[PDB]
Amino acid sequence: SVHIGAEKGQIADTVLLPGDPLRAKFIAETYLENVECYNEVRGMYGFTGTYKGKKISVQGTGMGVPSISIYVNELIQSYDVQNLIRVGSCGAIRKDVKVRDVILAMTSSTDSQMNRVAFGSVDFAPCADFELLKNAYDAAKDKGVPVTVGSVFTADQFYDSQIEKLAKYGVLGVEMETTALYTLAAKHGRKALSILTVSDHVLTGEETTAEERQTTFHDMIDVALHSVS
Amino acid sequence: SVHIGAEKGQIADTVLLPGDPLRAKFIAETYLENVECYNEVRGMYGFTGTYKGKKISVQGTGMGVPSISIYVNELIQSYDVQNLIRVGSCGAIRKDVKVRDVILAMTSSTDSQMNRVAFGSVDFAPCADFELLKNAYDAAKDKGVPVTVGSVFTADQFYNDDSQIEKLAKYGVLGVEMETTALYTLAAKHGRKALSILTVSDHVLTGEETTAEERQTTFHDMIDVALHSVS
Amino acid sequence: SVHIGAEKGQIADTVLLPGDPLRAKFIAETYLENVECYNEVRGMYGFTGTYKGKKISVQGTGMGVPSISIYVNELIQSYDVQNLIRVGSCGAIRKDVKVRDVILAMTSSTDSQMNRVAFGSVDFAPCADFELLKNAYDAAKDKGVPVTVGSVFTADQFYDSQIEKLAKYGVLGVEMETTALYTLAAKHGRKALSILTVSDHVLTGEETTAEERQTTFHDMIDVALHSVS
Amino acid sequence: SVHIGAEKGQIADTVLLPGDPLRAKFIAETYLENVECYNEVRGMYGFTGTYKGKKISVQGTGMGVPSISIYVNELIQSYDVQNLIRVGSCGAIRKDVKVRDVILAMTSSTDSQMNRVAFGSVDFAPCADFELLKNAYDAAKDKGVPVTVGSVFTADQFYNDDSQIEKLAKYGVLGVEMETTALYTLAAKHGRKALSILTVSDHVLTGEETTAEERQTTFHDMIDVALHSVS
Amino acid sequence: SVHIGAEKGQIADTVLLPGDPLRAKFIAETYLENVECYNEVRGMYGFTGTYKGKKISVQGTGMGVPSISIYVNELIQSYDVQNLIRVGSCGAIRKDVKVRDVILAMTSSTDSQMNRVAFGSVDFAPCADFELLKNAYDAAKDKGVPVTVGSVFTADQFYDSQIEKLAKYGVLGVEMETTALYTLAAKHGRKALSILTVSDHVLTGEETTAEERQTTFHDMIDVALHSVS
Amino acid sequence: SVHIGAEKGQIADTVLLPGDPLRAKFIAETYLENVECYNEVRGMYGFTGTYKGKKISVQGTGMGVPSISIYVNELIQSYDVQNLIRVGSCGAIRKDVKVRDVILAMTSSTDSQMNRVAFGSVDFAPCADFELLKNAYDAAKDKGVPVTVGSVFTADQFYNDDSQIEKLAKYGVLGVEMETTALYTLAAKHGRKALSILTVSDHVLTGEETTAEERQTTFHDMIDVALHSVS
Ligand SMILES: Nc1ncnc2c1ncn2[C@@H]1O[C@H](CO)[C@@H](O)[C@H]1O
Ligand SMILES: Nc1ncnc2c1ncn2[C@@H]1O[C@H](CO)[C@@H](O)[C@H]1O
Ligand SMILES: Nc1ncnc2c1ncn2[C@@H]1O[C@H](CO)[C@@H](O)[C@H]1O
């Protein structure tokens, strides 16, 4: 695959997808045993290790629909990946989404044109694989890890209009990857889920503290890993 | 309200929404105790009864986004309805979607322009209330009712020469109906809880039909799951 | 046909299309001789009787483009109907549309996506069959029944934006069916017309009285029936 | 106004709008008494004369929505024109539309973005003033001029590889031209009366051409109907 | 060709395209030797003469995308034209565009639907032929003729919204033809350029004087002619 | 700024923008004197050095409109960057576009919805700053570096089953990449100067690949033109 420097058999059937390749390194080095780096192409690191006997890969995606679409498509078509789990942050857009909540995205809205390019007059609604979702939910509920299940918004432009309106329709937060993941996974018959923590409140400008972030990042990765193994 | 002839207090917190008002009569009379008809306007019948210590209402919605939108808006704004559960059918668009499966719709695609009118360049993904969806899932699992959780397509044209159900199937979409996008959107807008529970009435892309007996089974399974889920 | 329980030959070549199936029953029972009910499917009643020797059917359509599209398509493809006349109400959006005017719709604007689904970048303008229209107009003018001829708006959402703008372009009123009727009739080479009365003024909130409604409903049905026979 | 060099009072209440300014000269000089040319700007000629006790003006519009929009806007806003009647040709897109038929356009479809720019998610259907359309119909019937009443397609691209005239024909659309949507929209916006009367110059979907003599006949029939309709 | 009354060989390989056919006559009669008029169809004059040995044609286009599209398509397909140069005016939309600047359009934005009809979900960006552009630029710079190189807006509706926004994105001015010229030329592998003078400032309402217009019109035609010969 | 960990004064006026942060390291270390790395956030490296008496910065942008938009916005708004030059590759979509040609993008088409979100019914054509484009052209000509000036297509989907690169090629579009529309749009919005200089990495519509040696040559030619153009 053009953007991934891996040999046959170097990437697991289950891949965690953080946006930041340095966070990919962090997750692998912190949570996994017998870690190997199978990709340094573009400095977008991919690693493979084991977690409680299960082979797991962790692959940086970059930011935005186009960047994640590249890596998801190559992981699927070139490396036969089956389960794809984004582990990221989002900006919360409602006050009832709390700083410690781990969010499981059922679906995502978008202003990306990726689907209108495919479907024209059809509004395509991306969907998480329910088995992965319910396994993640059960993993959180098993521990007492606070979890909220709803929809997100996949934005094409980091730097406001209608986020305001989307919040009024109960949308939980904004990030830049989920629509692409969910759509491409489903198109190839693979399983996908996006697990998200809150990096801030965008409407009130209320940031989260570094300590709060460290805790929720742990809960997120633990949920991702517990649910597949 | 203009389309529902009910006095305040006649409609329950929790409302099942078949498309067919004759099916609403059937549901209410078969499953519920001490049933009153509260609406006869346009023959779009609505009934209220009790199921295991709880008020349940059953309101026909009619067919298509605009029709169900009217009923859902009025139920929410004039009758303070909290929980809205569509109980209906869809045409399966994948072979792997079996005739016995009860479908729980996480989300719905659409060719309705209802959301584009509101959202412009935003593809709005409508979303089921997860609490209701999980309760329905659990109640199916409790009984062993076969269940599949995924997305549907909310079509504006039952008969469509320009149909892209072929493409939507390749993206894993389970089935086609005509109401869900509207239900999910309008409930979410007013902070109310919504879910669509669907049976399969045929496979659109093979033409293949289900038997009358098969439809009876799965309808029962669907209403059972629906009522047990809200207790 | 899936949604219509009629035997071969039970439905006339000319069908009146009220939205309300109870109004379908009312029209049939009040205006027609030797009435039979050929459809109770979904409680969306269809009846056939005679008016001055001519066989006439009256079929409920329900509300909205999708619902009428079903019944029009089945009446055309399964029952070979030739002339399709909607008899309904609309909300008037201009002050010069009076409470007693019977409206004949030449065409209709819409926010339904039904045509953009078919035509993409093309704005399709639905058109009434002129023969039916001119026959209706002549029937009204013959009696002195007040009639206004122009365009309407076919709305997808009963519960404002741009109705305001449409009024400024001379559009007469708002209803929820005409675009579908006109488009599907023309597509199958059949004849269609929508005859409408005023249920209220939407911009001023000015309602019509029950007596005013009863009179105009009579004038509308009499025009529909006089023009085909 | 910027595109019409007329002084106030030189333009009549009632204006015929050929696309071709040389045809405007022909109409005015052949049919009208005591004719003045009131505009030479861009060679888009405009003439005023009399027909049976009434002032009539004849203004070339040029080709396409943007061009006719300029003339129509200026005629309305600067010259208080009340009645605007396009007299022109279209290509037939159906076999059942005959070369001798004068077309009266009830409405027009378009691939122009002019209305989407204004109306967003609304498909605006432009509409002829019924009084003018009925007067034209009556004047044709009075003479036995063959007439067909229906819709046309207002195209932005005379030459179009991506053309959907095939589909528009299956929906009963009669013919293709390049002006009507603009005329009908802009007149309606300013509360003025508009109508397009059209002859058939060929069948686009067979390629088949009309003779010069056939075009002469039908042009006469069209102008006759037009002038007799306004008396 | 339907709209052009020319015999084979009457139109040069290089055509100047003013919007006004009277300006076509003016340019030909003033700048060219041995002038012939090859087209009077619709009074949309086309002329052919010589400039310093080079055969040159000057063809009126009319106003708007549809009108220019007709003449460009026939000049290309029926008369094999190679180089097509619009010589027109635009309304300047920025204060830094001066009344004496000759504008060379690199590209143009539009609210014409012509390209969305072709490309659907794609924003097509029309492009001037760089060879013609750079030759024009060098011709101006050779003389000291003031020249500004950027983008324009091709409007479908002479009689405001977003012109305001387009100015903020550095767009220079508004006219009604360039998108069509650039798109159709490129589609047929031919060379196109639009050279423009300022007829006024649209935002401040500041008009140019007749003398200023006469000077810039001369500079524009001289640049068009000098650059091809 | 949130994505760039630089203190004020560490980023130059003039910034080269490769997509690949490892290529930014390569450019800065190969071509520049006294280089500092000013950013390590997300491993999207950014370097500042000197070239012939001028500060030059080299910042990885990542792949696609949303990614480069973040970097470009932050460079402009937080670091007062004046000149932004993308140095990268594209896939050729025409046979007449040769592997050795350095491309200077006058404008870019896109299937990104970024401008439609802003502009509605307007097709926004983004535009290179002509001064920068002309300086690059001149510096290529000064050396005899083969150069082609034209448009590209900025794609949202590297892998696209619904691709219209076939049609875009017939309109003379030279090549496909994933960044230019964003660069040109956002620079123009903030009154800054932008240009994209591109090498060809293969022909997408024949499949045909360039050699490693050919890619080395043309990369050198591109960076040479880029640095010589800003002096
Ligand atoms: N194949 C199908 N296509 C569309 N709607 C269907 C189908 N099967 C069942 N339905 C549902 O049944 C109704 C019409 O019979 C629609 O409201 C729709 O919701
Ligand atoms: N086949 C046709 N296609 C498009 N326009 C036509 C056709 N026939 C006649 N016209 C009219 O004639 C003009 C161009 O000759 C256009 O303005 C258009 O209004
Ligand atoms: N054929 C191609 N299609 C899309 N992007 C390409 C191609 N060749 C090079 N690129 C550029 O390289 C990057 C991905 O390798 C993209 O950011 C894009 O800008």
Residue numbers in the entry:
A (entry chain B), C (entry chain B), E (entry chain B): 2 to 160, 163 to 232
B (entry chain A), D (entry chain A), F (entry chain A): 2 to 232
Share the article's original sentences.
Purine nucleoside phosphorylases (PNPs; EC 2.4.2.1) are versatile enzymes that catalyze the reversible phosphorolysis of purine (2′deoxy)ribonucleosides producing bases and (2′deoxy)ribose 1-phosphate. For this purpose, we choose the hexameric PNP (BsPNP233) from the model specie Bacillus subtilis, which displays great biotechnological potential to produce NAs, including the antiviral drug ribavirin. The crystal structure of BsPNP233 confirmed that it is a homohexamer with D3 symmetry as observed for other hexameric PNPs. Analogously to other hexameric PNPs, BsPNP233 is a trimer of dimers where each subunit interacts with the adjacent subunits forming two interfaces: the catalytic, which contains the active site, and the inter-dimeric, involved in hexamer stabilization.
The base moiety of adenosine (Ado) binds to the BsPNP233 active site in a very similar fashion to that seen in homologous PNPs. Typically, the 5′-OH group of Ado is found interacting with one or two water molecules not observed in BsPNP233-Ado complex, suggesting that the hydration of the active site may influence the ribosyl conformation. In sulfate/phosphate free complexes of hexameric PNPs with Ado, an O4′–exo conformation is usually found. Since the side chain of Arg43* participates in phosphate binding, the presence of this co-substrate and the hydration of the active site probably prevent the interaction between Ado 5′-OH group and Arg43* side chain observed in BsPNP233-Ado complex favoring the ribose to adopt a C4′–endo conformation.
